[PDB]
A and B are shown apart, each in its own frame.
Chain A
Amino acid sequence: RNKLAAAKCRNRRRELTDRLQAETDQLEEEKAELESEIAELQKEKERLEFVLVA
């Protein structure tokens, strides 16, 4: 077999892929926080608007 070929392929020169992967993760977390904040704020807008109509 040749598992060592593929494993060695993935192991050398990986600072790029790992740096890209890290940044990719960070953006998915930021994108999660922004979405929860938009959810939180929209509840507020719903909540506040409901008080005005009274």
Chain B
Amino acid sequence: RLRNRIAASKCRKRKLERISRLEEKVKTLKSQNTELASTASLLREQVAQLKQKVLSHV
């Protein structure tokens, strides 16, 4: 009846290590997404300004 107590603790520890693995994943992905979407915005802005520069020349 102890083979189950050490097996229930081995399982709970495995999920915790699993969760903290995901939460950091989710944490890192959001910060890369904020930096990408920040980068996309800047390019859209530059692409609009270049297009305007062309149309203003004929």
Contacts and interface: CB of A to CB of B under 8 A. Distances in A.
Interface of A: 2, 5-6, 9, 13, 16-17, 20-21, 23-24, 27-28, 30-31, 34-35, 37-38, 41-42, 44-45, 48-49, 51-52
Interface in B22-58: 22-23, 25-26, 29-30, 32-33, 36-37, 39-40, 43-44, 46-47, 50-51, 53-54
Interface residues of B, number: 27
Interface of B: 4, 7, 11, 14-15, 18-19, 22-23, 25-26, 29-30, 32-33, 36-37, 39-40, 43-44, 46-47, 50-51, 53-54
B3 to A, nearest CB: 9
